[PDB]
Amino acid sequence: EVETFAFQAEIAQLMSLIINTFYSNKEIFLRELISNSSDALDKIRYESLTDPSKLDSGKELHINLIPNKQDRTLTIVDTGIGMTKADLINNLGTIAKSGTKAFMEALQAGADISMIGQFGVGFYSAYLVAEKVTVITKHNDDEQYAWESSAGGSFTVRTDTGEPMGRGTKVILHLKEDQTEYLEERRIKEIVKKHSQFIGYPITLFVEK
Numbered sequence: 001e002v003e004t005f006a007f008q009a010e011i012a013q014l015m016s017l018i019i020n021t022f023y024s025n026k027e028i029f030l031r032e033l034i035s036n037s038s039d040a041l042d043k044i045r046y047e048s049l050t051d052p053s054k055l056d057s058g059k060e061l062h063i064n065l066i067p068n069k070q071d072r073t074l075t076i077v078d079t080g081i082g083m084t085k086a087d088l089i090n091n092l093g094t095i096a097k098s099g100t101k102a103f104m105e106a107l108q109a110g111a112d113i114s115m116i117g118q119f120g121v122g123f124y125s126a127y128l129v130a131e132k133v134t135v136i137t138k139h140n141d142d143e144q145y146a147w148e149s150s151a152g153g154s155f156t157v158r159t160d161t162g163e164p165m166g167r168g169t170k171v172i173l174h175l176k177e178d179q180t181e182y183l184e185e186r187r188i189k190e191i192v193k194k195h196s197q198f199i200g201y202p203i204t205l206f207v208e209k
């Protein structure tokens with residue numbers, strides 16, 4: 001059972017801008033997704049400070065980067081607080097309408113796309129490098145769900161039948177044909193060292209057979 005939703009007009013316009021604007025500094029997508037993961041890990045850690053049982057779904061707080069050249073996917077896994085189904089439909093837990101408003105005023109006032117994270121909509125920078133994004137998420141208060149969009153004005157949500165996550169979020173980037181450099185180990189290492197050196201959670205870059 002698959003539900004198809006229309007993006008709010010402002011969010012569709014944000015992703016069309018990300019997809020269509022000539023902008024060579026695409027590597028910042030990884031910084032933005034790791035920062036989102038760090039924020040989600042902060043949230044479940046804070047909740048656990050007064051309720052240890054919040055970590056019954058998994059005590060380890062970390063970020064994994066999983067490239068797969070055969071599938072042409074880069075997956076960012078975290079064990080953060082996750083998202084409910086309502087969070088997913090409500091723009092992945094962002095205030096994306098007002099954030100897009102401010103981002104687009106900043107762009108006409110000198111800003112560039114790399115500053116997208118300062119407006120709370122850094123997730124959508126995934127479409128700098130991905131033709132399709134799948135988000136698998138499990139929140140303590142809900143079931144496991146899969147969100148998916150190839151842009152074009154719509155997204156889908158379904159109950160996920162993949163591997164149980166326990167708790168957290170998995171962002172699967174189905175990379176564009178000309179963006180496979182972000183599957184190479186040395187390129188990912190360079191980006192993490194450049195932009196994510198002070199993230200307070202272990203970031204593990206998986207290797208491939």
Ligand SMILES: NS(=O)(=O)c1cc(Cl)sc1Cl
Pocket residue numbers: 064066075077165170
């Ligand atoms: N080791 S892990 O981070 O739990 C993991 C590996 C995949 Cl392939 S998908 C996913 Cl989640």
